[PDB]
A paper describes a structure:
The pH-receptor CadC senses a drop of the external pH and activates transcription of cadBA below pH 6.64, 5. CadC belongs to the family of ToxR-like receptors.
To characterize the CadC effector domain and the interaction with DNA, we first determined the crystal structure of the CadC DBD (amino acids 1–107) at 2.0 Å resolution. Thus, CadC comprises a recognition helix (α3) and a β-hairpin wing (β5-loop-β6) within a compact fold with the topology β1-β2-β3-β4-α1-α2-α3-β5-β6-β7. To our knowledge, the CadC DBD represents the first structure of a ToxR-like DBD. A unique feature of the CadC DBD is an additional short β-strand (β7) that extends the highly conserved C-terminal β-sheet (β1-β4) in OmpR-type DBDs. Consequently, the β-sheet in CadC is shifted towards the site of the β4 strand to maintain a compact globular fold. The highest structural similarity of CadC1-107 with an effector domain bound to DNA is found with PhoB. While SAXS data of CadC1-107 alone are in excellent agreement with the crystal structure (χ2 of 0.98), analysis of the CadC1-107 41-mer Cad1 DNA complex indicates the presence of two domains bound to the cadBA promoter DNA. We have recently shown that the CadC DBD is not per se dimeric. This is confirmed by the monomeric state of the DBD in the crystal and in solution as evidenced by our NMR and SAXS data.
Residue numbers in the entry: 1 to 107
Amino acid sequence: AQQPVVRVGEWLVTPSINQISRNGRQLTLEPRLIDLLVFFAQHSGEVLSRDELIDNVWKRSIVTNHVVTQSISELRKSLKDNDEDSPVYIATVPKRGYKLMVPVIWY
Ligand SMILES: [Zn+2]
Ligand SMILES: [Zn+2]
Ligand SMILES: [Zn+2]
Ligand SMILES: [Zn+2]
Ligand SMILES: [Zn+2]
């Protein structure tokens, strides 16, 4: 039985099984997305450039600037989980990149 390592906003994250979870809602994500989410949480409330995200989350793969942007949309979509009352988790900072806007608790 697996312990969450971190809480991002309303979601407990358990990277060992690629899972996020919220109040009786469990979701498995792709591992790269977990890795992106974990990177944001380690650098929370910091502006992260497309470049920082590529270097750290896509290590030893080349990707386009555009893979990042579509990964970001997929992660926003999973973090929202169809709840229109959800905060913004990942905010776009114009011309600069992205910032994780929710509280993080490490366990
Ligand atoms: Zn940091
Ligand atoms: Zn940082
Ligand atoms: Zn993609
Ligand atoms: Zn993806
Ligand atoms: Zn996908």
